């Protein structure tokens, strides 16, 4: 089920930029003299390639946020410069250019009968110069300065890194190479020019191990499923029927239910997986099954207390103590109330007198994990007395004492049955020692292959595990060792690192988007959509379950983390030049100025006679955004009624009128009555005056040579002039480099001889010869 | 450049690889194969027999594991053999203005096989402590099997040397020595077959 | 005269290669290696004539 969902994760795709991200493109426009006639020679200026910006300053900021999101989603990881190259037909040195549209622009400029020859010769002089000895090439490009800055920033922060065989040799986690039982081998070389991508290896910053138990439990369940998939199976189990009949002979009957190989395999896999992923487990057993109790006692001897729910631990301890321990020495049986902070084993330690049993109980009481930081990854390691398996002897001696006391206040048959059980468990001491050492080594080796922080916090969903399987495992283990297969281990490691990298990448994307949204003074956006996108893109949840409240709490938690450097600088660049991008649009204006005083108009070499106010000084500034937001109209109405100067700043669509009849007959101020009458400024449409020779009405301004005078001006800035000698640039890049992904497929490992396996202390793992 | 392919469960493969490493200079392979083979051989035969801890090692050290083996074992025969393999490299000579890489004289006449046989026979009667019964018996009997072919191994190795000399004589273009991208798969089982 | 075409013909006329797979940066390195070698006297004298 979920195994496919958590195993079908591929590394995040590195986009290959097919063309430079363009916002500005050249456009050829006519011009007029200061008098207002055509010049019969056109000039090329800058215009936005896209003109989908809607009116309203809030919608402007929304469009800016969408633009930032598009730029960050289309980020180039490795930027090739040989692929994007079309040969220029006009370069008399047979050069090559960066983009097909650049070639079209070069052809247009090279062939225009109204253009001079210096620019044409500069066009023809373009040629790429390649210096392969230092792995650097130069290309020509024509862009608006914003686009050139963005392209340079993309170029100079690529994620590639030189690759060598020893680098991959060091890419494996250290606690695998350092051990002897695993050996690595290669079969191919690597060139000095190849490059690869490093994943992200930063720890948790959402604190999902605290106060977010739902998603944490979901992730733990997924990782537990994966671990169950990866942990190796058992080989060479003793025949079930022979073991059953041998135990039956040993017990002298005239119990054994639940002893099958599948049970042992499931118990082994479940125990290892739960230990690995910190998924707590709950037990269940019939209180009148002594052998189950002893097997559970062994299980508690090996595995520490912290990985068990208080209910199961309390029940197991109560059963063990009041069925064996106080029964031995004939002391009054304890009544451990369900809910005291003390544990039954602690009270037993404080009560009994004999040495070995008390020592063993004391060991099982306070045996906690140790937090150890290795190679930047936090891990949980058992006490060193458990890996070499000596503590089992400290168990058995105590059990041996249990066979010496007379068991007073009990019938003979009960003592006989308990002695039979303890003897059956005792005769298999070597099997238990080998199993415990194998478990320790397998846990250490496997757990050394995870790269995310782990915490010991009980979660909501609890694993079910019956003790009969544990009894079967303890009675059925044999001689053949089991070592995890290198192929499975590498597959598990690849999946884990892929998951971690995906998580970190999505975190950074969400943080960048939220930071930009909150710094652009956006406050009318339901922010649950971004969190929903993040959760969906993590590719393990369904947004149909987690409600909105946790999304908002996660957003508040996420705001604190400082954003990554590249995205922060991208946002800084896109915000520092916001005004130039916004004003240069030819679909919206920046406000309307009203003065009710005779003022002259401006003369520009792109609009002819246009009504434009470059600055807004000397007037009262009123925000249209606030005007729509609060719904008030008090100050503006009183200012306009008494015919006093006013200034409005905000986004407004414009209507172009090019009739001198409209100029003489004042109609540029009659679009303010609806503000009072309709009391809504959503569709305010100021009229843009424009006089030139194209309109066939310019003879009025020529015959009588009068200076046009109006009463309104529009807050619009004339677009900046275009010069070819300035947009030219020599982009820097790398000649050629093969990007490598899925790197670990180039290393193969061979299992050591299973007999000669060495775990941690220069000794063989299993020894039952 | 030759890559080494093996299945570590076949100890006879590593036993034959001992001869392979003795005959062919170690600079003809890629570093991955050399370090893998050295680590396996050292941690499956010799250090197992000499009661020493398994060689903790880190990939990428400037010194090969065989050097560490040379400066950690004081058994004269195997130590001398390990040193000889350690400093066995292609010899740079120029003949008639033509650059060539040729083997050392000692291996050319077929003499190192006697040293290998003596070292193997020394390992044969060794105590081999802290190892199970059947595994140790099989290991030492395979070692005896490879030792029991002394004359044939000498003839084979010196025939290889003579064939190499004769073929290399007519090479016109010089040959440099540098690692390359691709390699050729050498079958360890085939090496064992040729040896036996 | 695009030197890449000449290097392509030279590589293809070695009968042991395949031009359609070669990388461009290595081609440029090979070209720069070729630029600095002195030509044999016969061809230089033919060019002089």
């Amino acid at each position: 089920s979920i195994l496919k969902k958590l195993e079908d994760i591929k590394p995040e795709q590195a986009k290959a930029q097919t063309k430079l991200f363009r916002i500005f493109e050249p456009r050829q426009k006519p011009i007029y003299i200061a008098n207002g006639e055509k010049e019969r020679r056109n000039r090329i200026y800058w215009k936005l390639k896209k003109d989908t910006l809607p009116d309203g300053d809030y919608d402007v900021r929304e469009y800016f946020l969408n633009l930032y999101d598009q730029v960050l989603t289309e980020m180039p990881d490795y930027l090739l410069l040989k692929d994007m190259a079309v040969e220029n037909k006009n370069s008399r040195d047979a050069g090559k250019v960066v983009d097909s549209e650049t070639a079209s622009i070069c052809d247009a400029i090279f062939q225009d009968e109204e253009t001079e020859g210096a620019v044409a010769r500069f066009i023809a002089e373009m040629r790429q110069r390649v210096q392969a000895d230092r792995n650097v090439v130069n290309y020509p490009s024509i862009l608006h300065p914003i686009d050139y800055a963005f392209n340079e920033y993309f170029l100079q922060h690529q994620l590639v890194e030189p690759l060598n065989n020893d680098i991959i040799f060091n890419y494996i986690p250290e606690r695998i190479r350092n051990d002897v039982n695993y050996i690595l081998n290669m079969d191919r070389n690597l060139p000095s020019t190849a490059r690869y991508i490093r994943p992200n290896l930063l720890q948790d910053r959402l604190n999902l191990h605290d106060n977010f138990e739902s998603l944490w439990d979901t992730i733990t369940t997924s990782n537990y499923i994966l671990a169950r998939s990866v942990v190796p199976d058992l080989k060479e189990l003793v025949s079930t029927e022979a073991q059953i009949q041998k135990m039956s002979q040993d017990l002298q009957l005239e119990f054994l239910t639940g002893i099958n190989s599948q049970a042992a395999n499931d118990c082994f896999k479940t125990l290892i997986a739960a230990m690995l992923s910190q998924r707590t487990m709950s037990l269940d057993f019939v209180t009148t099954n002594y052998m189950s109790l002893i097997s559970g006692m062994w299980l508690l001897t090996v595995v520490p207390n912290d990985m068990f729910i208080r209910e199961s631990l309390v029940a197991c301890q109560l059963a063990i103590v009041n069925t064996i321990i106080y029964v031995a020495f004939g002391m009054q049986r304890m009544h451990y109330r369900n809910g005291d902070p003390q544990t039954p084993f602690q009270i037993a330690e404080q009560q009994i007198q004999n040495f070995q049993v008390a020592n063993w109980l004391h060991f099982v009481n306070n045996n906690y994990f140790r937090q150890v930081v290795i190679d930047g990854v936090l891990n949980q390691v058992l006490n060193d007395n458990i890996r070499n398996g000596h503590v089992i002897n400290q168990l058995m001696e105590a059990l041996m004492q249990l066979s010496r006391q007379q068991f007073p206040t009990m019938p003979v048959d009960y003592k006989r049955s308990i002695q039979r059980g303890i003897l059956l468990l005792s005769n298999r001491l070597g099997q238990l020692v080998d199993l415990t050492r194998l478990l320790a080594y397998s846990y250490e080796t496997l757990m050394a292959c995870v790269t995310m922080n782990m915490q010991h916090v009980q979660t909501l969903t609890t694993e079910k595990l019956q003790l009969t399987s544990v009894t079967s495992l303890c009675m059925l283990i044999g001689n053949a060792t089991v070592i995890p297969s290198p192929q499975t281990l590498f597959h598990y490691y690849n999946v884990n690192v892929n998951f971690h990298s995906n998580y970190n990448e999505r975190i950074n994307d969400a943080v960048a988007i939220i930071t930009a949204a909150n710094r652009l003074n956006l406050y009318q956006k339901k922010m649950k959509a971004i969190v929903e996108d993040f959760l969906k893109r993590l590719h393990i949840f369904d947004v149909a379950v987690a409600p909105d409240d946790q999304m908002y709490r996660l957003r508040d938690r996420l705001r604190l983390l400082p954003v990554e450097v590249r995205r922060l600088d991208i946002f800084n660049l896109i915000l520092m030049a916001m005004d130039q991008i916004e004003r240069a649009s030819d679909k919206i204006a920046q406000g309307v100025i009203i003065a009710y005083r005779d003022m002259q108009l401006e003369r520009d070499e792109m609009y002819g006679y246009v009504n434009i106010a470059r600055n807004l000084d000397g007037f009262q500034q009123i925000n249209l955004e606030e005007l729509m937001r609060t719904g008030s109209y008090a100050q503006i109405t009183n200012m306009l009624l008494n015919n006093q100067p006013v200034a409005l700043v905000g986004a407004l669509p414009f209507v172009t009128d090019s009739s001198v009849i409209s100029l003489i007959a004042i109609l540029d101020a009659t679009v303010f009555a609806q503000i009072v009458k309709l009391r809504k400024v959503d569709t305010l449409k100021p009229i843009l005056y424009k006089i030139n020779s194209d309109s066939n009405d310019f003879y009025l301004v020529a015959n009588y040579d009068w200076v046009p005078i109006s009463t309104t001006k529009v807050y619009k800035q004339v677009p900046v002039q275009f010069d070819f000698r300035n947009s030219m640039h020599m982009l820097t890049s790398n000649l050629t480099f093969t990007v490598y992904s899925d790197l670990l497929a180039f290393v193969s490992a061979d299992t050591v001889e299973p007999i000669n396996a060495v775990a941690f202390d220069n000794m063989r793992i299993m020894n039952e010869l | 450049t030759m890559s080494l392919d093996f299945v570590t469960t076949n100890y006879m493969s590593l036993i034959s690889g001992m001869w392979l490493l003795t005959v062919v200079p170690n600079d003809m392979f890629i570093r991955e194969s050399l370090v893998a083979c050295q680590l396996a051989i050292v941690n499956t035969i010799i250090y197992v027999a000499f009661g020493m801890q398994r060689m903790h090692y880190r990939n990428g050290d400037p010194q090969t594991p065989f050097q560490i083996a040379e400066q950690q074992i004081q058994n004269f025969q195997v130590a001398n053999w390990l040193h000889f393999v350690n400093n066995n490299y292609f010899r740079q000579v120029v003949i008639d203005g033509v650059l060539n890489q040729v083997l050392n004289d000692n291996i050319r006449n077929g003499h190192v096989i006697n040293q290998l046989m003596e070292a193997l026979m020394q390992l044969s009667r060794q105590q081999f402590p802290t190892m199970p019964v059947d595994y140790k018996r099989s290991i030492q009997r395979g070692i005896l099997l490879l030792s029991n072919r002394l004359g044939q191994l000498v003839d084979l190795t010196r025939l290889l040397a003579y064939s190499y000399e004769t073929l290399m004589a007519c090479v016109t273009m010089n040959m440099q020595h540098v690692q390359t991208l691709t390699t050729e798969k050498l079958q360890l089982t085939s090496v064992t077959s040729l040896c036996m | 005269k695009k030197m890449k075409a000449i290097v392509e013909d030279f590589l293809k006329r070695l009968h042991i290669f395949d031009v359609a797979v070669a990388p461009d940066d290595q081609m440029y390195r090979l070209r720069d290696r070729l630029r600095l070698l002195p030509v044999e006297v016969r061809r230089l004298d033919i060019f002089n004539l």
Partner: peptide, 20 residues
């Protein structure tokens, strides 16, 4: 293992597409 072999073939083919 078959998927692993397919992935390794893909990687080695990417490497081989730089050898004439």
């Amino acid at each position: 293992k078959t998927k692993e072999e397919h992935q390794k073939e893909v990687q080695y083919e990417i490497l081989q597409k730089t050898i004439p």
